[PDB]
Amino acid sequence: YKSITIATEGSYAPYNFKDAGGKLIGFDIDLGNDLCKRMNIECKFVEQAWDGIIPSLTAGRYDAIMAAMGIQPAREKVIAFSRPYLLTPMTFLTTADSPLLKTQVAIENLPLDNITPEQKAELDKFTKIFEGVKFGVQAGTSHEAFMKQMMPSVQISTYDTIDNVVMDLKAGRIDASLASVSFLKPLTDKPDNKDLKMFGPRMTGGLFGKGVGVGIRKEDADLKALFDKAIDAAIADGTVQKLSQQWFGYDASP
Ligand SMILES: N=C(N)NCCC[C@@H](C(=O)O)N1C(=O)CC[C@@H]1C(=O)O
């Protein structure tokens, strides 16, 4: 390999978004540039809307995806992933004045790979509390998949970007959402968002899979091996931890 093109979305801060000059910035951009230097490959980042990001990769419009993409079983049917470069659970989001905040969380860390009756009881409790509450999620994400598969009785609206979800939650058009802690912690830590709060169980596994990874075509085994070696080195030397603290305000490195 000499040169590759990496697609990102550009609407998911602090992983990938646009600066004041319209340039793509964020953890995925800084990490991608560091990995390419390690691989001795020239890389160019390009913006791609979330809906077509996977088919444009398999159609050969670019060589990899770094766009806060969870390594999840459904996507693994279509593309390959590097080993994870970040780990994060998933949790809920509402407004700081919401009555939803008073709900007792019986299971703080809720793994979904093998749901026990106790874990199902906790998911069912939140489903019942959420029935009547209007949820908003970004379309085409594990957030949408979780609500449709695990909480089908809850009213959901899907959005083109997570930015539009947050806009509608702030405006009171929706009452709650779901996303990773890696997205929600920096969002709620901003003084701009003192009116927003994370809540509920922190979920992992199941349809969410594990980790955030670089999406690569299945046939590109050598490119996956190059990324895996570079990611292992960036984790080992503390680069991923450094970038995670810079962008997220905490260490989400594997
Ligand atoms: N708009 C984007 N560029 N990416 C949205 C990805 C959301 C979600 C997913 O892959 O479907 N995520 C995962 O399930 C774990 C990491 C990520 C998240 O919730 O932050």
From Swiss-Prot:
PROSITE patterns reported for this sequence: SBP_BACTERIAL_3 (PS01039)
Keyword Transport attached: yes
GO molecular function, one term: ligand-gated monoatomic ion channel activity
Entry keyword annotation includes DNA repair: no
Subcellular location: Periplasm
UniProt similarity note: Belongs to the bacterial solute-binding protein 3 family.
InterPro entries: Iontro_rcpt_C, Lys_Arg_Orn-bd, SBP_3_CS, Solute-binding_3/MltF_N
Pfam families xrefs: SBP_bac_3
Keyword set, alphabetical order: Disulfide bond, Periplasm, Plasmid, Signal, Transport
Cystine bridges: 36-43
Principal location class: periplasm
Function: Component of the nopaline active transport system probably consisting of four subunits: Q, M, P and T. This system is also capable of transporting octopine provided that catabolic functions are induced with nopaline.
GO cellular component: membrane; outer membrane-bounded periplasmic space
UniProt-recorded name of the protein: Nopaline-binding periplasmic protein
Domain of life: Bacteria
